[PDB]
Write a protein that binds this ligand. Structure first.
Ligand SMILES: CCCCCCCCCCCCCCCC(=O)O
Length: 133
């Protein structure tokens, strides 16, 4: 499936408005200070219909395991306890998180060999560019 092309190890090389995105979510000053400095590595694995996404950095590490279209519980890096759903739309992996009546969407797409992660919360949009190792 289109999800197979995402498999690999990816390193952050560019970031726009991630602090705005964290501030919109309610991430505090001290975590924002450090998180703005991180250049995470994301490792994406797929085993049959189970997809694993690890995000790793010197600050915080996260891991999620999911199947497309099946809701799962997630505890985000900023300790939101969210209900999450990931689906494929064309070539885009769309990850929607919901908590406390709020919602944010993390979209992953391959563009010219790079992984573009778009983070949307309300009107705030952050774009994170990852390069394959
Ligand atoms: C796990 C390393 C990420 C460092 C940031 C931790 C505090 C902010 C968390 C906000 C939501 C997570 C957004 C993911 C960003 C990404 O994968 O590049």
């Amino acid at each position: 499936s289109m999800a197979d092309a995402f498999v690999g190890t990816w390193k952050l090389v560019d970031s726009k408005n991630f602090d705005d995105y964290m501030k919109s979510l309610g991430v505090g000053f001290a975590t924002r200070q450090v998180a703005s400095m991180t250049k995470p590595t994301t490792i994406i694995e797929k085993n049959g219909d189970t997809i694993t996404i690890k995000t790793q950095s010197t600050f915080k590490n996260t891991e999620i395991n999911f199947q497309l279209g099946i809701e799962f519980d997630e505890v985000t890096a900023d300790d939101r306890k969210v209900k999450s759903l990931v689906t494929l739309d064309g070539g885009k992996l769309i990850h929607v998180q919901k908590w406390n009546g709020q919602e944010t969407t993390l979209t992953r797409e391959l563009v010219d060999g790079k992984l573009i992660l778009t983070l949307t919360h309300g009107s705030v949009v952050s774009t994170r560019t990852y390069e394959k190792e």
